[PDB]
Amino acid sequence: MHLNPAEKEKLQIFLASELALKRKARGLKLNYPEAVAIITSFIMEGARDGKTVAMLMEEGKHVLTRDDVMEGVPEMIDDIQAEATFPDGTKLVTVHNPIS
Amino acid sequence: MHLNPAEKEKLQIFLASELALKRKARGLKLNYPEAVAIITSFIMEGARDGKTVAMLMEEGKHVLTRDDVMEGVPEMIDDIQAEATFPDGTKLVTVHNPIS
Amino acid sequence: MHLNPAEKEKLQIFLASELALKRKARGLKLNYPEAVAIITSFIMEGARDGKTVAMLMEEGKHVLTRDDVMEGVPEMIDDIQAEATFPDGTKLVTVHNPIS
Amino acid sequence: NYIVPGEYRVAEGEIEINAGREKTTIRVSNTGDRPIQVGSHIHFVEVNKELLFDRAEGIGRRLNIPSGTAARFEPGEEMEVELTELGGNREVFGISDLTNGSVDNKELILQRAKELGYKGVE
Amino acid sequence: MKINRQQYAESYGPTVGDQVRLADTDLWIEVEKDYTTYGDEANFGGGKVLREGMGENGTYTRTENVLDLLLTNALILDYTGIYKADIGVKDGYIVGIGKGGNPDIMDGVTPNMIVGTATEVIAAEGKIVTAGGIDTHVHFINPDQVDVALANGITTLFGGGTGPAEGSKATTVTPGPWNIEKMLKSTEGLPINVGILGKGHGSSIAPIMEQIDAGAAGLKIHEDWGATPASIDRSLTVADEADVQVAIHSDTLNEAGFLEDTLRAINGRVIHSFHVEGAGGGHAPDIMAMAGHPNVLPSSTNPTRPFTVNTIDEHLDMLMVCHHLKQNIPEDVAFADSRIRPETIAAEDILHDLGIISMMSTDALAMGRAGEMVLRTWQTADKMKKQRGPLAEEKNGSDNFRAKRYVSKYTINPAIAQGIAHEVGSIEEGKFADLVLWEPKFFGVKADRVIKGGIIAYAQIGDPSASIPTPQPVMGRRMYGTVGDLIHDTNITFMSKSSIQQGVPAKLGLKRRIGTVKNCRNIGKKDMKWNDVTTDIDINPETYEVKVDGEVLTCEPVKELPMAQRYFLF
Amino acid sequence: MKINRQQYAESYGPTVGDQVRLADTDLWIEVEKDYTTYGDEANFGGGKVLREGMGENGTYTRTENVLDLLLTNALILDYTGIYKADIGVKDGYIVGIGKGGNPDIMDGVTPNMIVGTATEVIAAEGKIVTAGGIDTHVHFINPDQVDVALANGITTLFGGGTGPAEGSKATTVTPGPWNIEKMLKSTEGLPINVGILGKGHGSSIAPIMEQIDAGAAGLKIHEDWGATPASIDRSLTVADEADVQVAIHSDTLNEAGFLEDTLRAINGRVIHSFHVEGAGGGHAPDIMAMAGHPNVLPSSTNPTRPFTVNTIDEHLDMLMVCHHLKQNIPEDVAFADSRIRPETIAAEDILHDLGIISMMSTDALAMGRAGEMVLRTWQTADKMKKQRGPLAEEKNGSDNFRAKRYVSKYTINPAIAQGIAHEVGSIEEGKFADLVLWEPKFFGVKADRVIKGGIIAYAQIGDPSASIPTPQPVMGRRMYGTVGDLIHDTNITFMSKSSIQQGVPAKLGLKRRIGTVKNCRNIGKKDMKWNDVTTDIDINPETYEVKVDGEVLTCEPVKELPMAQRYFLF
Ligand SMILES: *c1cc(O)ccc1O
Ligand SMILES: *c1cc(O)ccc1O
Ligand SMILES: *c1cc(O)ccc1O
Ligand SMILES: *c1cc(O)ccc1O
Ligand code: NI
Ligand code: NI
Ligand code: NI
Ligand code: NI
Ligand SMILES: [O-]
Ligand SMILES: [O-]
CATH class of the missing domain: 3.20.20.140 (Metal-dependent hydrolases)
Structure with missing residues (x-):
């Protein structure tokens, strides 16, 4: 596979996102690390799909809403940042105030 | 996400439990580490759901039965212990003789 | 669970294979590490199922085809090697030119 | 009773910066063709040569703006700024090498400014 | 020129009388006193105060009242008080609690808390700092x-x-x-x-x-x-x-x-x-x-x-x-x-x-x-x-x-x-510089940065392959103080x-x-x-x-x- | 006896005039010259050239023109040229670029590139080697x-x-x-x-x-x-x-x-x-x-x-x-x-x-x-x-x-x-042996082996519990040079x-x-x-x-x- 250090670390984000999505599916309000994991994995999968940085800046604000997360979690998350390999190489995505 | 060392380690248990559940779904009798992973992940997800320590001590004895696991595995597992964050903070669950 | 170093490392292959299978399911042509992960996890799950080394040498050539992967990926993968615990203990599987 | 973790409850009132120091308003012009942004704590006489203002009125002074903020001058832009007095020992070293000592040495500062072509030595 | 208290606290951290919630508890701490001189707050970055000839002194050698490290704008929570100050560290010890910067141009600088050529900066504005x-x-x-x-x-x-x-x-x-x-x-x-x-x-x-x-x-x-x-x-x-x-x-x-x-x-x-x-x-x-x-x-x-x-x-x-x-x-x-x-x-x-x-x-x-x-x-x-x-x-x-x-x-x-x-x-002058910075939202839960002997030993920080240190995954990691x-x-x-x-x-x-x-x-x-x-x-x-x-x-x-x-x- | 160029390149890596694609780019590099003597190429393994009395000299002590390490059949990409050579390392430095082996029996051996009892071998055939x-x-x-x-x-x-x-x-x-x-x-x-x-x-x-x-x-x-x-x-x-x-x-x-x-x-x-x-x-x-x-x-x-x-x-x-x-x-x-x-x-x-x-x-x-x-x-x-x-x-x-x-x-x-x-x-005689081996398919993307001071420091290698080093998972790992x-x-x-x-x-x-x-x-x-x-x-x-x-x-x-x-x- 030839995994480099970042590829090994970022597998953890996907795994945490899978865990969080199972918790959401059984009706739980998500906590701070669950919410971050879901939005982060969404960004990295979007890059893999070949979306633009600008599409993901927009979409990342609509992945989770206030009624998906516990009290205070929207206000704890000022942004979420992720780097992934786009068709044009690694880029940084920053999602501002992802949960309104 | 701000993962601490325990949160990183415990992602591994969930992953091993997902692996074991896929092996069980395709008809395999589970082995010792598979059985432990499934029961452990069940306990940690129960805490996340907001069950009590006493509910999980009872439920953990009914997650896998003798006919789910290979010969000798019930007698190899004297107990399974896990710590997780309950609504009232971290607690230890011990499941005694989880597989009869 | 009593995980040894190899068991911990090999959980990563299963996780990468799950990631790659989700990318394939949403219609993406797979890349080099995705393709390797899928075929590797297939081999290790085959051993767990109790298939022979010779069955897996044959089957591993039919897990992914040219139209599942990006241009050049078939020619990048000369073989895939994996060790897993068969009913008769650890064995090495080598799949030659897995993607034609 | 909605809990925002770590939130502030600030007291009433306002914070007066540079309290008790003399304030001076001056007009400043960016005569150059590239933008110039000036921080709160640069000795004002030592700014970019192409800013035209009465250089004597920048001696011993800096911008009366919140600590860590900056005034921006677009190419060709003229605007008024408010200055406050430097404090502490009222000495400046380095920056443009116009002072290298007390800010009281107005004569010497302006002679160096004029020789090096800092605009507005009057 | 006056700054509204909400904006002041957002830029420099809280000041006298301001309260801060500890994590998601009901506990509020109040700033008891502040060592700063309003308008001469220390801060670091592009066009900021701690620059040569300005809030950084360009004259003094390290031995001459200059710090190895300044923690700017800390909200200290300690048995000795709950208060706002800069913290100065030298030779791995806390040498000054007060106001850092450049006596050339700033009022109220604590005499051994000069920011000089030798000085590193940690921004503690909006953080709680404990022993x-x-x-x-x-x-x-x-x-x-x-x-x-x-x-x-x-x-x-x-x-x-x-x-x-x-x-x-x-x-x-x-x-x-x-x-x-x-x-x-x-x-x-x-x-x-x-x-x-x-x-x-x-x-x-x-x-x-x-x-x-x-x-x-x-x-x-x-x-x-x-x-x-x-x-x-x-x-x-x-x-x-x-x-x-x-x-x-x-x-x-x-x-x-x-x-x-x-x-x-x-x-x-x-x-x-x-x-x-x-x-x-x-x-x-x-x-x-x-x-x-x-x-x-x-x-x-x-x-x-x-x-x-x-x-x-x-x-x-x-x-x-x-x-x-x-x-x-x-x-x-x-x-x-x-x-x-x-x-x-x-x-x-x-x-x-x-x-x-x-x-x-x-x-x-x-x-x-x-x-x-x-x-x-x-x-x-x-x-x-x-x-x-x-x-x-x-x-x-x-x-x-x-x-x-x-x-x-x-x-x-x-x-x-x-x-x-x-x-x-404790955070006192003369003691070893073992300091923990907390974001208030994580106070007592997950430390931001742990300083040991004046060098960061442990931090919650992100992807080491990224353009900047904050992209995911953010997790606790050993820093150069451990190496x-x-x-x-x-x-x-x-x-x-x-x-x-x-x-x-x-x-x-x-x-x-x-x-x-x-x-x-x-x-x-x-x-x-x-x-x-x-x-x-x-x-x-x-x-x-x-x-x-x-x-x-x-x-x-x-x-x-x-x-x-x-x-x-x- | 003649070898077809495709087969030559598969066995020993490319030679003069042959081109190699860099990863999945459109960029082609061409071998400008080759230090080898055709038929006396160095290689290591069962029945191969670098054996005692054959391509390995059995006479000389380490000080006597013997290498600590020979990289065989490297395609060097460097400011000094794009060419085929053996690379000899001794005391952690590059001491020879040319042709390694045994002057007893081989033509064209660079005099300080003897393979002896003291010599380790890295096969670089089919690899690109850079500084x-x-x-x-x-x-x-x-x-x-x-x-x-x-x-x-x-x-x-x-x-x-x-x-x-x-x-x-x-x-x-x-x-x-x-x-x-x-x-x-x-x-x-x-x-x-x-x-x-x-x-x-x-x-x-x-x-x-x-x-x-x-x-x-x-x-x-x-x-x-x-x-x-x-x-x-x-x-x-x-x-x-x-x-x-x-x-x-x-x-x-x-x-x-x-x-x-x-x-x-x-x-x-x-x-x-x-x-x-x-x-x-x-x-x-x-x-x-x-x-x-x-x-x-x-x-x-x-x-x-x-x-x-x-x-x-x-x-x-x-x-x-x-x-x-x-x-x-x-x-x-x-x-x-x-x-x-x-x-x-x-x-x-x-x-x-x-x-x-x-x-x-x-x-x-x-x-x-x-x-x-x-x-x-x-x-x-x-x-x-x-x-x-x-x-x-x-x-x-x-x-x-x-x-x-x-x-x-x-x-x-x-x-x-x-x-x-x-x-x-650079890859030049007299410089420290910091060398990177690349498979051409991964050139500039993922290094195969990183040599630091003449010892592998980092490698893409597989399961440490396996019978051989190539089984999955293959990932970047610190090697003995770091220990x-x-x-x-x-x-x-x-x-x-x-x-x-x-x-x-x-x-x-x-x-x-x-x-x-x-x-x-x-x-x-x-x-x-x-x-x-x-x-x-x-x-x-x-x-x-x-x-x-x-x-x-x-x-x-x-x-x-x-x-x-x-x-x-x-
Ligand atoms: C010509 C065309 C581009 O798109 C870029 C550069 C040159 O020279
Ligand atoms: C096992 C080991 C200890 O040290 C304490 C308790 C159990 O169950
Ligand atoms: C009063 C009520 C509790 O529940 C606990 C302690 C005191 O003092
Ligand atoms: C950018 C740069 C840093 O050093 C930290 C955080 C952001 O967003
Ligand atoms: Ni005791
Ligand atoms: Ni005890
Ligand atoms: Ni720069
Ligand atoms: Ni830089
Ligand atoms: O104890
Ligand atoms: O930079």
Whole structure:
């Protein structure tokens, strides 16, 4: 596979996102690390799909809403940042105030 | 996400439990580490759901039965212990003789 | 669970294979590490199922085809090697030119 | 009773910066063709040569703006700024090498400014 | 020119009278005073104050009142106050608390807090800064425990053990000269401050004392080695000669004595009473009465902190499985029922709030959680505010008095108990620069950056392959203070005076900073900051009812805690 | 007996005239010459040539012209040529490039390249071998950054920082004697070569110079510390006395001057201009004009490399969030728009292709990617071939001229700029054996094996529990060169002449190889290999149009790059 250090670390984000999505599916309000994991994995999968940085800046604000997360979690998350390999190489995505 | 060392380690248990559940779904009798992973992940997800320590001590004895696991595995597992964050903070669950 | 170093490392292959299978399911042509992960996890799950080394040498050539992967990926993968615990203990599987 | 973790409850009132120091308003012009942004704590006489203002009125002074903020001058832009007095020992070293000592040495500062072509030595 | 207070606090952190919520608790801390000069605040970055000829002095060499590091705009939470200041560090020590910058141009600069060519900058605006936690009940069982501790803001581990040997799994003991030497060598690789306890057991002085001369920093008396009148007496005789502290886990079984017999053996000498509530160990059922005595320095361990609806079920089962007790053997059930008591656990919450229990600690990996001493201190303070109200001593609607009482329990009080408060345990000039920065939203839960000896040792930081340090995944990671030989200069090995005089560090090749244990034998309860109450504690032998000043101390368990499921992935 | 060329290349790697594709790019390199004697090629294994009495000499002791290591059948890609040779290493240095084996029986053996009893063998047949990359813009923020760098073939990190402190997060600076000493000690544990930059800020010589005497290898001038005429002047006065290099991130804000004022302060002295395009920092909008001057050694940082459809969106947002800029504050938007310019980023691609920008670098964790300097160099060369065609200087349909121009940017040119090219930066006899083996299919993406000081430090290798090393999972892993004391002998700490003369290594207990920085003050643009062009660069202040020789330099961004989604899991 030839995994480099970042590829090994970022597998953890996907795994945490899978865990969080199972918790959401059984009706739980998500906590701070669950919410971050879901939005982060969404960004990295979007890059893999070949979306633009600008599409993901927009979409990342609509992945989770206030009624998906516990009290205070929207206000704890000022942004979420992720780097992934786009068709044009690694880029940084920053999602501002992802949960309104 | 701000993962601490325990949160990183415990992602591994969930992953091993997902692996074991896929092996069980395709008809395999589970082995010792598979059985432990499934029961452990069940306990940690129960805490996340907001069950009590006493509910999980009872439920953990009914997650896998003798006919789910290979010969000798019930007698190899004297107990399974896990710590997780309950609504009232971290607690230890011990499941005694989880597989009869 | 009593995980040894190899068991911990090999959980990563299963996780990468799950990631790659989700990318394939949403219609993406797979890349080099995705393709390797899928075929590797297939081999290790085959051993767990109790298939022979010779069955897996044959089957591993039919897990992914040219139209599942990006241009050049078939020619990048000369073989895939994996060790897993068969009913008769650890064995090495080598799949030659897995993607034609 | 909605809990925002770590939130502030600030007291009433306002914070007066540079309290008790003399304030001076001056007009400043960016005569150059590239933008110039000036921080709160640069000795004002030592700014970019192409800013035209009465250089004597920048001696011993800096911008009366919140600590860590900056005034921006677009190419060709003229605007008024408010200055406050430097404090502490009222000495400046380095920056443009116009002072290298007390800010009281107005004569010497302006002679160096004029020789090096800092605009507005009057 | 005036700045609105909301905007001021967003740019520079809070100032006098402003309040800040601690994590998702009900606890509010208020800025008591501020060392700044408004308009001359220090800050670092593009077009900011700390630039050459401006807020950075370009003249002075490092020796000339210049700092190695300035923490700008810190909100300090410490036994000494809750206040706003810059913190200056030099040669790995706190040298100045006040106002940093450049006296050339700024008013109010503290004279030894010059920002110069030699100065690094950490922005602490909007952070809470505390001393590193001092955990005095550590079992050295699994080296992975060190990162767990750093992640929750602990910087000093005092205790014992050789790894997962049964003696170590039960007791905070590194026994004898050879095991002590081996663990002092191991310590060279641990990125945290350390002190080692020897076995406080023997009927002759020499086998106990040779541990102190070998490099132990104190002793542990534990019932599993025989917490007998003789072992208690010989250990305190050694401790009084050697100037080190003795910790005790007393005879739960009352085999050779009841509590009054243990106190007679102690004979008025200073002692640190571990897990004084007694679920973690001690004379059944009345050990917690120790906390009323003037010669006792009393600590709790953390799993009883605070009293929750799962506490008893979790403890009874934990005790039964760890002691190999059988639910169908009546003596085993009677023992468990005598040791795990809702009456004493509930009263323990109140004794913390009243300043009668002075310290917290973990009992890491024996009966306690390496990374939850700080966490559970604040959960306890929060539960007490909800159930008892603001303390009578509070003003302005703040919880400052409670916050100073509780921060003292895991910073300065353990350091005083152990004889190490000359080096660590508080943000004061002249002490080692062990500092923890917290985002208020994560206060007491997950540390932002842990500074050890003036260099970051541990941080919550992101992808090492990224363009910037904040992209996911953000997790706790060892920083450059832990790497190569810098681990030696950023951490202290605390040792007895006698081992230092005898040259043990040179004999073993220890390269770490060597800290001297001292001034542990002529202290008492009165020396515990904000937690100095002596009183008659009565524990009813039939009902386990706790009384203080004829008042029954009872309290309800809670179903939910802050600093819990909002934060943790598991 | 004759061998078909396809079969020859499969067995021994390519020979004269054969071409090899670099990864999944359009770039082809051609073997220019071959040192072998056909039929006497060296190879190792069962029934192979390097056996006692055959291709291995059984007579000579190690001192007698015998190698410690032979890399057989390497395709070298270097500023000195693209050619086929054996590489011989001894005492951790490259001692021979030519033909290895046994003069007893083989023709054409290079006299000091005897394979003897003492010789290890690495098979390089079918591999491309390059010098280790030299990254001269490193922020030391997160120690996990070192493996990221090794995995993409970087072997030397020059820069500064103390971990995730705000000064370090912005600037390549280890400030002052104490922080420098602490980071030199930290370096003992980092498995890569290192040089530390001090703070290039001050109005007096002594506070700057004391950093050089403490063990700094150079200085960094950064606008966040005040990139003033005084700081520039004093730093270059120090550098000229000390024989170290100065890097500059100029005054973006034009606060104390425009570019012409910075050049007047420099006064013709040598300087390394970091991120010369200016997205990473510098006089807005015209800093990139620095790259035309004969006394400037100009580097790019990597996120602008090359110009893609996501570049501007990604940079504008990155700058706004990292500077805490608000989208509704017009001065913040004007600043961002003045700094992030498609006109200068597009022209930067062409200035690389023309040899006007001489070097690449990362800006690791401040505004750049630790593991993408090599990656993005080749993506840029590939994009330029697609858009501009083969360079006029090419022959035989190969891209050899472009490949030498581009490999120079991250190997020899940074090494010359820093004063360390006597030790590192190229595959030449007499230089340290820092070598990177690449499978062509992964060239510039993932290194196969990274050799440091003649021992493998890092490798892509599989399951450590397997019968053989290739079974999954194959990932980057630290090898024996990083373990125990061998980390000292395989890596170099680069230091000033003065710190070496003053005995800093012995004072601090440094065990690493000590490299001397020298010959940095009487070089210029003309000394940059294949990248030596001086010219008048005009940047239009209204349109940001770049002209060179009256020609507007414009270029389109691309939607896709090679060395991207075929390779990476994320
Ligand atoms: C196992 C080991 C200990 O040290 C304590 C308790 C159990 O169950
Ligand atoms: C606990 C303690 C008090 O003092 C009062 C009430 C509870 O529940
Ligand atoms: C955070 C930290 C930096 O150092 C840079 C940018 C952000 O967003
Ligand atoms: C870029 C550069 C050139 O020289 C020509 C064309 C593009 O797109
Ligand atoms: Ni105990
Ligand atoms: Ni204990
Ligand atoms: Ni820069
Ligand atoms: Ni930089
Ligand atoms: O204990
Ligand atoms: O930079």
